[PDB]
Amino acid sequence: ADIAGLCARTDNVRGQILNVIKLAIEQAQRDRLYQEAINPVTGTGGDGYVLYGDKTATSVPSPNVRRLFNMLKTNIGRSSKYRLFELNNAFTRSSFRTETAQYLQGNKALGGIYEYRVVCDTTNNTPSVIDRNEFVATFYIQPARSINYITLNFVATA
Amino acid sequence: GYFYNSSFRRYATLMGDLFSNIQIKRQLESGDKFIRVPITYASKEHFMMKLNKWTSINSQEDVAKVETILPRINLHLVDFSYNAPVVSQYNPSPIKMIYELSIFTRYEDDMFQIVEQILPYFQPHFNTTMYEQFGNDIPFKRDIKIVLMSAAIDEAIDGRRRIEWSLTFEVNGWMYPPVDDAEGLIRTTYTDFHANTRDLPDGEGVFESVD
Amino acid sequence: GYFYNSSFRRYATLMGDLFSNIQIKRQLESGDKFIRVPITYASKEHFMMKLNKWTSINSQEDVAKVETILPRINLHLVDFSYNAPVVSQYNPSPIKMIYELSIFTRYEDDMFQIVEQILPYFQPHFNTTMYEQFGNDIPFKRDIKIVLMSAAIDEAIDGRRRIEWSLTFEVNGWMYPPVDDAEGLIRTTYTDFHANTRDLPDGEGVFESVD
């Protein structure tokens, strides 16, 4: 219940918790718990702090990184309302692309995403050809602290 | 029998069409008659030749028929040059085109009416946003500035005969290499003298044929 | 039977060849026909005299063969001067050369097609890198700026008859004393309107003979 609010906080949705006065438990086990993808709390010299950032993660690279991606994906999908507004064309590739790109670029400028290449990190649903189809937003984004680009695809289509 | 997507053609038709819909009031006994001024696109020399040909009384049926020919307007391109402020075509090239708009009239009153319908909309310039859509893509937005450059007043007598006033206009427009008509016909709209968005009629619709 | 390595000759051919490959679309029932516009190099007056000789309707075999003559382009040098920014020849002298490119046409549409294929590439200037290799030595790199200076529109009537538009071009090039053809033939390449590195054809290939 607590750590969840501790997320609404730090980055987008691990730094001592507020009103604790004792934890049920406070190295081998800790390393074991990590990897297990479990969120531990440890107390050192008094005051307990979050050992690790979180998640019961699975097939992805081991890497905060998640929140960046989850947030982007969630926001991108909402922009789907726009699709109903207009028709799909080459131009629609632009426009939608420009809109999302502006959002993505902002993330980079603020910091949070790095090495974002508008050229080949954006969307073309159809294979690069004259032919095209509805647009799905696929993006390769890299969280600032991690040398890995992750591919995420969200689709707006029939 | 013509390159439909011609940039020159589009500017000729745009210009022709801003001035296509001009009428003069002509008071009759039965009541007021409003007559539309017919517009042609032709070299001035050419137009004047054919105009002397139409206005010639060869037979008796000509006598009446002859006073319907005037008033009219002839339009022509007379100059163009690069318009000084990676590949080229939307992004396209700022060009500047010079048009002679020539009003001919048998009566000072006719002239006054017509020109009063042209002149006030150029202070000294008249802006218009033009939209050219390719097949089905997002239309392109070309900002077209038309500037009234100068005017010229003259006659040509015989006993009435014929008044000629010419306006010179600078269109600040856009050029790019030809896009084949086979690649799809360009769709064009624009804002008229009242910012009302008409769409560009085909050439054949605006200009009466000098031929 | 001509000084092959003539610098004036090279520039005449460079200019002629940039404009060697211009076609107009001409719609037929069987299908669209594309016709290449033939280019000549001649003093303008000369070209026009001979053009009046070809355009004269002498017989019935002449009547048809009339619309194969137009459209055409005539090219000529009309002025040159030093181009104010140990011995002299590569390192050579900055010269400036003035060319009149005269387009003649029976139909406004023809003109529109042609000029639309020229005009957008001069804003107001068009760059081309030229490579001139001597025998087998390392090539020389001459940067050539061609500037569109002005255009001039005219007619010449008889009942249609003939539309004439003339472009004037400033080539910012390079002059040096003649290098004998016997010392080895010059190899020349250049970048066309699309940065495509074509190699400069011999004179005899670009210009049709006015003679």
Swiss-Prot record, chain A:
GO terms for cellular component: virus tail, sheath. Keywords: Viral contractile tail ejection system, Viral genome ejection through host cell envelope, Viral penetration into host cytoplasm, Viral tail protein, Viral tail sheath protein, Virion, Virus entry into host cell. It comes from the Viruses. It is found in: Virion. The keyword Lipoprotein does not apply. The keyword Cytoplasm does not apply. GO terms for biological process: symbiont genome ejection through host cell envelope, contractile tail mechanism. Its main location: virion. Structural component of the bacteriophage tail which consists of a contractile sheath, a tube and a baseplate. The central cylindrical segment of the tail consists of a rigid tube, composed of multiple copies of gp19, surrounded by the outer contractile sheath assembled from gp18 subunits. A total of 138 copies of gp18 arranged into 23 hexameric rings constitutes the sheath. During infection, contraction of the sheath drives the central tube through the host outer membrane, creating a channel for DNA ejection from the capsid into the host cell. Belongs to the myoviridae tail sheath protein family. Hexamer. This is Tail sheath protein. The chain holds residues 472 to 646 of 659 of the full protein.
UniProtKB/Swiss-Prot annotation, chains B, C:
Keywords: Late protein, Virion. It holds the Pfam family T4-gp15_tss. GO terms for cellular component: virion component. Gene3D superfamilies: Myoviridae tail sheath stabiliser. Stabilizes the tail sheath structure and acts as a connector between the end of tail and the portal vertex of the capsid. This is Tail completion protein gp15. The keyword DNA repair does not apply. It is found in: Virion. Hexamer. Interacts with gp3 and gp18 on the bottom part of the hexamer. Interacts with gp13 and gp14 on the top part of the hexamer. The keyword rRNA-binding does not apply.
